Every structure is written in C-alpha cells, then in structure tokens.
Design a binder for this molecule. Structure first.
Ligand SMILES: [Zn+2]
Ligand SMILES: [Zn+2]
Ligand SMILES: [Zn+2]
Ligand SMILES: [Zn+2]
Ligand SMILES: [Zn+2]
Ligand SMILES: [Zn+2]
Ligand SMILES: [Zn+2]
Ligand SMILES: [Zn+2]
Lengths: 347, 347, 347, 347
C-alpha cells in the first residue's frame, strides 16, 4: 500500500535548484488525509512560491504545486466525510484554523493561519501529499484526474470571480485575456452560468478557440486600437461585469472604462507591484465597483467542480512527467507557456 | 399667488459673475412641479457647476444650486402623487427619461438624458424653481426646510454610500473625513443604521463634535502618524467598510489598506483628476471592493429623509440670505468653509 | 392614419356577454401612448377579470386582455423614450403613480393606484389601446409580435419567479407543472438562466415536449406515485428552488417537501381561495422560504424580452382572430386549453 | 483539575424521570473540547428533547440542555483556536461533518450528521460537557456566563431571524410575541440592528417591559381586537418584516396579513404540528415571503454574542441550581414560565 518513500520535486532555498528526488511519505495528521497525487497542474503561483517574491514567507524545503488531483490513500483520525479510494484535490488553500472570524464567514483564504499548499505546506508536486480533510476538494468518481487538476486552481478562481461580478443571466461579461489559462476557463464558466461572454485577446488562432468554447464577441486587442470603444459598442453601453485575467496594468485600467455604469470589475491575477489607478470621478459618477477575487471557498469549489462534472467546462491540458520539472519552471520564467501544463506523478 | 418674476442668483458664462437679480418664474411642464424654494444648501458641486470643469456641458445662463427645500406652489398636469402646499425637494438629479435601462433598474443618475438641477436645469438658487414630479423629494410636513436642505444632497449621498459598503449592523465603518459636511452626516447615518462608526479627521474641536453625533473611535490624523495601524488596531482587523468623504488621493489610497479583508471602500467625492491607485495584489489577496457612490435614487431619498424625520440625523447649518451669493461662492473657492451653508430665498 | 373607430371585444357587466363590436379609438393622455395592438394573448387572468371574482373592482364596460404586442401609432406629450412605429407591449400592470413608496422601490405592481390593463383599464383586446409610456414594454424591432405576446405575461412572470427563487447557476429548479403555458416558458427561462430544470407534469407527449425545450429530469405525476421521493432522488436532496406554476393546493403543499434545505418555493399562480398549508416545523428546521411572485417590474420586462430576443425562449402559440373571442373565453372556462392562444386584432 | 466524576441531570427513557446524580466526566475527542459548564439555560426545546415528540431520534441516556456557558477546561488534540480558561458556549448544534454541502455553504444545522447537544449529544445540564471546537461559541472574557447562556439559544435564533427578514435600517419589524423569552431578545436585537420594533403581546406589565428594552409601537393583543388593522396603521402599510416568536397558528396566519407588500415573515418557533395556512392569492399578489429560521451558523453566533458584549441586548434571567431540575421541567410542561431560567451547575 502506502510506501515509506516517494519521488517529489523539492527545492531547499528560494529561487534555488529543483531536485526531483526521493523524499519521505508524509504522515496524515488527525485532521488531514493522505492523497496519492496522480496529476498536478503547474501555474504562475508556483513560480511566485519558488522565487519567494510575495510578502508571505515560504516554508523551505518545499515541494511546490497546488492543483493536485489524486486518490485518498489513507486518512487521519477525525476525517469524517471521506473514504479510501475517494478522489481528492489539493487546492491553494490547504487548511485554516476554522475558529477565526473569516473561516466562520466562509472566506477561509483570509485566515491568518492559512496553510497554503505549495507555499507553506508540502504541495502536490510529489506522489503522496497530505491535505486538510475539510478543505480538500471532493472530486467525483470517474472524472479524469488529469483534466480536473487545472480546474482546481484556475476554474475555481474564475467561478469565484464571475460570482463576485454580481452578474445576472444575460448580462455581458468581458474576459480581458479571454483565451488561454484562466481566460478560457472563465469563458466557459461564464457561458455555463448564463452570461454573454465578450473576449479581449490577441494572437494566432485565439478567436477561433474563443468561438469554440462558446464566446459571443471577440475584440482582437492587436487588430483593434480603441478597445474601450469596441467593448462599449459590442455590449451597448459597456460590459456588465469585467473579469481581468490579464495582469497588465494598462488592461486593468482600461477595464474600468468599458464596464457598465453600476458594473463590476473583478481583478483575478496577483501581480508583483501592479496598481489599479482608476479615475475616481468616473468610478463615482458611474457607480463602478472594483472587486478583487481570491481562491474561493469550499462552496465555490463544490460548484466549480460540479460545472466541470457536467462537461460544461473542459480544460485542454498538456500532460508531462513529474521529472520534467523543473524544465517547466525555467520554461515558465521566460514566457513559453500555452494552455495548462499538468505533471503526472508516476512518470 | 405665483408671481410673474422672482429673484435668483444667475450667471451667464462659466466662471463668470453671479448676478442676484430679477428673473422670470418658470412654467412647470406637464411632468414637473413648481416649488417656492424656501431654503437651499450650497455645496462644492455648485462650484464645479460654476467653473464648468466637469466633462458634462453646463447649461448657461444658469441658476445653480441643487439642495433646495421648498413648498409645492402649483404643479404640472400629469403630476400624480402631489398636492399644493406640499413640501418638495430639488436634488442633484432633477429628472431622467424613465424609459432607459438605468431608470428602469433604479439608477436614474446614470441616465444619458439625466437632468441635473443646477447644472443643466434651473437649480434651486432662485425663489421659484421647477422639478420633475417623479424625482422631487417628498419632504414631510412640519420639517424644518432649513435643516433638510443640506440633507437633500449630503445626507442622501452618505446614506447611499453606507448602503453601498454592504455592511451589516455591528460592523465597523470608518468615515475618512468624519467631521464636517458629508462626514458628520455619514457618522449620524452610520450610527442610526447600526454600524460602529470610526472617524478619521483632525483640527480643533473635531473629536468632541464627533463624539457628540455618536462616533465610537476617532483617529486624529494630525496627532497620529500611522493611520492604517491605528484603524487596524481600533477595529481589530480593519474597518468592515470605509466611506471616503475626503477627496484627497492619499487618504483614498490609505483607505484600501485599513479596510477589512472582504471589506468595501466607498468613494463618495468627485475630485477633478484624482486616481485611486490601489495595490492590485493586496486588493485581490484580501478580496477588497472599491465601490463608487453617486447621488442615490428615490428609494434612498425616501429612506434618508425618513431617518432625518426621526431626529436621528441633524444638520447644523448656517443660514444666510440668497443675496449673500456669490460671497459664498468666492468664499468656497478659497476654503473658508465650515459645516453647511444654507441660503434663504426670501432674504 | 389613426382611425376614429376600431373593433374590440367589450363586455358591459361582470360575467356578461362579450360583444365584438365597433368602439371608439382611445385618446393617449400626456403620459400614455397609443398602440395599434397587432396581436394579444389570452390567459386565465382574463377569465378572472371577466367574472370579477377577484377582490379588486373591475372597470366596466371593459375591453379585457393584457398581453398585447403592437405598434406605437402616436404617443402622448411627455412620452420621452418612444418613437412612432416602435413596437410596444401592453402588460398586466399598465401604469402606477410613480410617487408611492413601492413604485420608487421598483415594485410598481403593489402601487395602490396601479392601473391594471384589462382589469381597470381598456386592455389589449381591441385594435388601438393606450398604455402608460413608462410601463409599456420595449419590444425590439423585427420580433414576431405574435410570439412575444404570450411572453409579455407568462414569460415575464416566470423570469421574475426564477429570479425570486434566489437560485445560482447549476442549482436544481423544479417547475411543478412543467409543460404548457407558464410551465414551458419557465423551463426555457430556467435553462437559459443556467439552472438545471426538473419538471413535474403528466399527460400525453408532455415528457417529449419537456425534453425538447431543454429539461433535465421529468417526474411524470401520473406514472409516479411519490413525487417528493422522486424529486429528492433526482436532485440529490431536493430542488434548490421550486416554481409552482400549478395552482393546485396539493402540488403547492408538496413543493414545500421536496425543496432543498435553505431552498425557496415560489408561488406564481393566483388561485381563488387556495392556501399554502406548510408544516411550520419542517419549514423552520429546514430554513425553507415560500415566496410569492407577481408580474414583475420594468427591469424584469427588459430582461425577459432580452432573453426572448436571443431565440433562447420560444412561445408556440395558436393564432386566431379577435372575432373568435368569446369562443376562447367559453372554451377556457371549461378547460379545453393547450399552450397559448393569441388573437389577431385585424382578423 | 478535571475530576473523574461530576453531577448531572440525566434521564434514561423518553418522558421518564430526571435523575440529578453522579455521572462520569466526558473525554474530549480530538476535535472536541471539554467545558466546565458554569451555567446553562433551560428552554422549550429541552422539553421536546425529553418527551421525544420530534422526528429525530433522541440519544438515551441523555443529559439534556443546550445553552451552556462555561470555561474551557482541557481540549482535544486538533483544537486550534482555543486555550484553557477560555469561555466557551454549548449551543443547540454541537457539531457537523464539515464535509457535506450544507456545512460548506454555512448552514451547518441542515447537516445530516448534525450533532445536537442535548438531543443526540450529552448536553449542558452537567458540570463538564464536551463540545466540538469548531462550533462552540467564543464567549468573550469577562462576560457574565449567567446572562450569556440564554443568549446562546434565544439570542442567536432571533439574530438569525432578523437577518432572514431581509430588513434594512429604519424598516418596521413586528415581533409577534414581543415580551418574554425569544420576544424580548428579538426586540433588543431589532432595536440594535436599526429596525423600528413593533410589538404584539398581552398581559400584565408587558407594555412597560417592552418600552423599557426599546420598543416603538406595542399592539396589546388583549385590548385590541383587530391586530392586523392596528399593525397596518402603526406601520403605515404593514410591518416590513415580521418575526413570529409565538408558535400559535392563528398569530402565524395573521402575520401574513399585516406584513408589507414585498415583506418577509420569519417563523422562529418549532411547534409540534402547526401549519402556516396562508392565502396563496394574497401572498402572490403582494410578493410576501414566509421564511423559516433555524439556530444560526458560527457567523451569526459571533455577531449575536458581539451585540451582547456591547451591552446592547440584556437577558434578565432567574438563576436556580442544577438540582432544581427537574422541577423546572415539570413547571415548564404546564406553562408556569416567565423570562429565562438559568441553572448553575455547581449548585
Ligand atoms: Zn481560521
Ligand atoms: Zn494555480
Ligand atoms: Zn432615463
Ligand atoms: Zn450638493
Ligand atoms: Zn405608484
Ligand atoms: Zn396573462
Ligand atoms: Zn456536515
Ligand atoms: Zn434553547
């Protein structure tokens, strides 16, 4: 059954060298459960955990990775709603104290004692990884653990963002960055939730991919010069809600100018030092909200995975082996990324 | 009854010279009603209508003023829910087309055809002024038309702002600029709505005035250096909702750093070229919303006037004569303002 | 252009005899607009206006009918957002005082001075009928005025009901009475809004029609005995929101027993003396809400017509002539109804 | 420190004989914490747990009681946000599986595996009792554990009920049963939350008590015959939200007739076989909601205790000894109850 040693990609100092080597198998605490992580997505947050450029101190030595779909192989003692052989998911937020005000309200991510898998907890870039039983995702049985792994971070983040834009069905939503990664998952979640997706991206074959996943209007930010005017025209007044899955400060600032009066602008990405300099007079005189959206609680996880489990959203991935890390890390530092990159822990 | 000529303070060109002289008595259209404006507040928006520095073009020649409490002396033809001798109020938003999407949703202020009394409509700085019957405020009988006049713009703006911070009773609210004008009315509305008012202002006798109107915690922004730390300490994590009644860009930017995780920051003032440069990473990672709030619809008017009509909020004013305009205009351009300045139209 | 005499179906006493005869052409007041009603739906509310069995007193003599799609042929004087040749729609609520608390809040239907077209106002069973310009529906250009006429009452009522069940996308909704009239329009609106429609109806060819308009689960209330158990099984706990488009007291009472804990039960129909006897202990211990839903405001009209104008909902009708009234009235008194019955005013 | 045997009031069969005798000291599980219950309120739910008349099966032998304020004397192993000597509170809902859909959404009370302290868990009628660490209340330090004990069930139930009536500040709330037990706590919570409390109760000295705790209007249901007309008069249209803390079916049915159009009627009590037979036509035509409200989650506990900890709500109690049980049980079966009855576990 559970071995005494597994193979993980561990690094010992910030921005250091990633070693795919044998490490011990963790011991599930009385609240945690052990997960034979089958696959695990890789995303920019793993770069930011590697470098350590974010304020929160990173635990070291660290097995990064926070989008890990796997099988429950043995649990803790108080673990209640879980069985062995159940599929589980390691998300960004591994666990919280569940006694603080935020955990009680539902926003466990704002917990001061938040355990961030792959940042301050042994993440999912290993074969066997532990995850708090309360927060682990209840991936249904029979789902492709390869495809759901990117949905564990990008899908749950964009489901929360589209629920944070206070949109109603039929309302225009403008996904700034609407093809690739968070953008395409946001387009599919918005289309499944009822909204009328407008997309703002550019490059080769972006518009046909966008139309394929069910987008309504596509503003090519290369061909088109005035994006704000194009969005105000296509939406007939402005997008009812904007989802800024593009961390560039210019796009973020522009999204406050094509969002409808009384419309919401959700910021999803976490840049290093970006600022949302928005004209205060225009934001006041048009009653525009500029919301920020973090990972999303257990209800948003349940509902995003339930959208996935109906074939409504699909995550085209590229599966590689766990040993291909850190070629993915060094490839991601430059910008040679396309879609989502899943790693298989066995390979 | 209704004369054929009244005395108003009218100017003929932007930033020009204000003439307190005889002008005609308006004719109420079939939707409008004529109001013997008894008193009328003066506020910074009247400076901005005078200069014309805002984007929207000002009608000229113009009798400014948009906080006018008065008596209904004759109405139009389709005016339905009004009688003669009824008290009415001229607010910023005079009327809208009531057929556009926004008017239907409730946000009449975002109407493209919004009639802005004192900007694109003969305002309330005259004896007799017309106002759309749908939008005019239903000032109850027996109220002091001198005191309710400032409540027609500052009170209704801060009631909307505190309803836009999505606060619940017992939640901390931090009124940045919590003494004088919008600030003290916001403190009284917040205290009447249930919130626990924190105040951030400085000067002489500001803290005692604040405590008098029912404030809980007062951070003196002159004595105290680190305001953010003081608010995080007093509120035990941050204010649940911030109301930025101080248009300074530094205070606006700081208010995004002492608002609670999952907390809202309402921007109330309309500066000329201010920007709310907020750290995108912090706003995302803490799920902070930055809402803007405009005048407020007819329901917010009904409810703000209903709070006033219970003696819960009180507007200490300085009553002058209508002939004292434009000494108030030139006094306001410099910054010799304190509290609210009401003008009596008879005097 | 506008004639001086048209042909309408008018009756002079409650439950009397309906006379398809020549009547005058109304004169649009300064707020109203005249509509060459092209088509007009017929629904049970017209029976209830005919009999007069409802509490509110019916104006007599009365041209009933309240789902009238037509062309704006001449308007009033203050009518602002309208042109000639524009398509308009006469809904149940013709107009309100727009100065009362309810009109201000958005719920114009609760106005004490509500003008109910076809009950206390010359309805849409005539060629030319007047309707308040604020409340008339803004039917887009090019839409089939025959098909949108049933959407003016059933579609707008079920869009409001599904927005009153506080559902989120992916939540189960159970349309009790899910084929025919309000039921099929509710199924199509629920499917377009994102919910997962469960249907509860019985008869011939009901399930295939249901599947055609996009239903997910169909409980045949003839084949199946325990409906509550079947819904709890299909929904995995209960429907998140129930829409009771079947006025039978047994179905209404059962819908409080298969709605999810913390779920909503919207009552749409207006029976004569039905009661919703719900077990108080079960409703408390499961936090079940039992909402009622009326016609729906101008925003719900705009949004329901916008769903229709995307081909998302479709109203299969039977078009007859206006002279076929009152054969439809006497046919409807018995129960020989199927789908929706539109009348053409020219024929 | 922690003894090996304490004194509790335990019964061994439904409706049997209550024995105040020595029982063992429980062992806190790895999630639970042990509480030296200092005081404990007694309420009708304890009668219903004793008789066993409710559907859910009662654990036997059982130490009832579910409003127990006490001191944390030793905790479990994974208990995170707790220290020794901390004040804790045993509420109705002792713990849930925290992996089900409801627990995730926030409504832990609807959990199928809900542990109901004093029904299916050793309650708080003993000296030392265990309670799940996640759900136990965080009673602040220095509070009178005698007074907060009734607030642990009645206060948290009425805070949830007033938050379930979707009221805004200044809206009328009508507490049907507005003096004694749930009623007076609901009056104080409603007054602290901002609403304008109307009260409906009768007897000696009820109106003066009501006025003392901050009620606005009191309809004496003995002197007054038409309660509905009196409430519609006092509220000027109906109460915006009704709180039915009186389980009588006649009062519940009447509360659906004096609640405002678009108003909410919260049912708080859990009778044995009561039904809320409401006129469906009136509920539809006025858009009235009839919500039910259960215990309330950890956020509602935090916020109700935070209202208590500001001296805004006060619970006048009668403290007796734990040995006086079951004289309180047999006294409560008849109806010789007044206010709240706290038992001291030491005495
Ligand atoms: Zn926590
Ligand atoms: Zn990620
Ligand atoms: Zn308009
Ligand atoms: Zn003003
Ligand atoms: Zn009205
Ligand atoms: Zn109809
Ligand atoms: Zn649970
Ligand atoms: Zn209790």
């Amino acid at each position: 059954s559970i071995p005494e040693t597994q193979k993980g990609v561990i690094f010992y100092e910030s921005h250091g060298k990633l070693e795919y080597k044998d490490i011990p198998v963790p011991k599930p605490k009385a609240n945690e459960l052990l997960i034979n992580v089958k696959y695990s997505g890789v995303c920019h947050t793993d770069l930011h955990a590697w470098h350590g450029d974010w304020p929160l101190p990173t635990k070291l030595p660290l097995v990064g990775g926070h989008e890990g779909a796997g099988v429950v192989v043995g649990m803790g003692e108080n673990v209640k709603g879980w069985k062995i052989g159940d599929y589980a998911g390691i998300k960004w937020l591994n666990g919280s104290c569940m006694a603080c005000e935020y955990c009680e309200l539902g926003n466990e991510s704002n917990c001061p004692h938040a355990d961030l898998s792959g940042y301050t907890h042994d993440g999912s870039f290993q074969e066997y990884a532990t995850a708090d039983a309360v927060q682990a995702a209840h991936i249904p049985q029979g789902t492709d653990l390869a495809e759901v792994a990117p949905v564990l971070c990008a899908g749950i983040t964009v489901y929360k963002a589209l629920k944070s834009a206070n949109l109603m069905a039929g309302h225009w939503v403008a996904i700034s960055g609407a093809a690739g990664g968070l953008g395409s998952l946001a387009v599919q979640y918005a289309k499944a939730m009822g909204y009328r997706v407008l997309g703002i991206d550019g490059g080769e074959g972006k518009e046909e991919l966008f139309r394929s996943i069910g987008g309504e209007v596509f503003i090519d930010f290369t061909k088109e010069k005035d994006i704000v005017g194009a969005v105000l025209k296509a939406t007939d007044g402005g997008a009812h809600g904007v989802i800024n899955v593009s961390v560039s400060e210019a796009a973020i600032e522009a999204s406050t100018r094509y969002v409808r009066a009384n419309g919401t602008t959700v910021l999803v990405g976490m840049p290093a030092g970006a600022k949302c300099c928005s004209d205060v007079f225009n934001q006041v005189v048009k009653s525009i909200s500029i919301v920020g959206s973090y990972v999303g609680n257990r209800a948003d996880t349940r509902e995003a995975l339930d959208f996935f489990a109906r074939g409504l959203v699909k995550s085209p991935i590229k599966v590689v082996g766990l040993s291909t890390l850190p070629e993915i890390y060094e490839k991601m530092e430059k910008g040679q990324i396309v879609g989502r990159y899943v790693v298989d822990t066995s390979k």
